[PDB]
Amino acid sequence: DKWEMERTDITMKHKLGGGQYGEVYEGVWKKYSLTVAVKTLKEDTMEVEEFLKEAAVMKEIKHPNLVQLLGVCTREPPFYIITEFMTYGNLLDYLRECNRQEVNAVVLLYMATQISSAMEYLEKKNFIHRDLAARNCLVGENHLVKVADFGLSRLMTGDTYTAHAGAKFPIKWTAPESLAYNKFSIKSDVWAFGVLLWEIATYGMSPYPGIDLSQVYELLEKDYRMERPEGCPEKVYELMRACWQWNPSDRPSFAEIHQAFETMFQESSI
Ligand SMILES: COc1cc(Nc2c(C#N)cnc3cc(OCCCN4CCN(C)CC4)c(OC)cc23)c(Cl)cc1Cl
């Protein structure tokens, strides 16, 4: 298959975390002397189908702000997904721990711009991401941000993907139509992206603070939305609000979102 490699080609270095879809390691791809991230699957389990689903999809994708697949090991346990190493880890912990004088307003714009660029790409390729949130974005040197892409679905025929009944979603990031009917689309991602913008603007606060999960849907029904975070530019909140339109069709495209952030980033850098 050519994405296939010898498991003996990697040496494991440190556990970084995991559970999960599988546990995650810092590793070294020996013949390139290259630090890499390795997702692992101990034995066969029920979650093996999950695994190669990710693997398959990640091969179909290439973008500067999408985590680059390097190789896979899928002939027998253990199982390896191998990606580039995102040095600073996830964006949520990053925002929370950063030096805000360094990671300032111009930088937050840069990060929104980078993410929206990735999502514009997925929009065109007819992909949806099932879990857009700060925790699923990764950070490298110099405020480089990439969206993690193990949880992607290709739209094979049409507009909306339907998740299996009984599926649990991260309530606070999830579009109304997704919570209600289990339907995901690129416009559901646009909604989630709105939440992501709020996380970025607040340096990683939890969305709908103190609000009871079980009541979020009802609130959204009655046009309750999160308020403008402190220091968030009015235009940025306007976009947030556009992302959170009740009708999917009323929400902007990622092409529009990216264009808008590109413009704001150019002006901020001037
Ligand atoms: C390869 O397979 C997969 C791997 C992943 N997950 C990761 C990808 C990817 N992709 C890339 N890069 C990662 C870097 C990580 O931490 C590196 C440094 C952390 N530190 C925090 C403390 N300080 C300050 C030093 C830095 C990390 O930690 C858990 C997970 C990463 C996913 Cl989500 C899915 C699949 Cl399929």
Author numbering: 233 to 502
The authors write:
Chronic myeloid leukemia (CML) is the result of the constitutive kinase activity of the tyrosine kinase BCR-Abl, the product of the bcr-abl gene fusion present on the Philadelphia chromosomes of patients with CML. Bosutinib is a second-generation dual Abl/Src inhibitor that exhibits potent growth inhibition of CML cells in vitro, is active against multiple imatinib-resistant BCR-Abl mutations and has demonstrated efficacy in ongoing clinical trials for imatinib-resistant CML. In the course of studies of electrostatic interactions in the ATP-binding sites of several kinases, briefly outlined at the end of this report, we determined the crystal structure of the kinase domain of Abl bound to bosutinib at 2.4 angstrom resolution. The structure explains the effects of imatinib resistance mutations on bosutinib binding, and provides a basis for interpreting spectroscopic measurements that probe the environment of the ATP-binding site of Abl and other kinases.
Crystals of Abl kinase domain bound to the compound from Tocris Bioscience were obtained in the same crystal form, and we solved the structure to a resolution of 2.4 angstroms. Bosutinib occupies the ATP-binding site of Abl, sandwiched between the N-terminal and C-terminal lobes of the kinase. The only hydrogen bond formed between bosutinib and Abl is between the quinoline N1 nitrogen atom and the backbone amide of M318 (a residue in the hinge region of the kinase), a characteristic feature of the binding mode of this class of inhibitors. The 2,4-dichloro-5-methoxy aniline fragment of bosutinib is oriented at a ∼65° angle to the plane of the quinoline heterocycle and fills a hydrophobic pocket formed by residues projecting from the N-lobe into the ATP-binding site. The sidechain of T315 is completely enveloped by bosutinib, making extensive van der Waals contacts with both the nitrile group and the 5-methoxy group of the aniline ring. Both the T315I and V299L mutations would result in steric clashes with bosutinib, explaining why these mutations confer resistance to bosutinib.
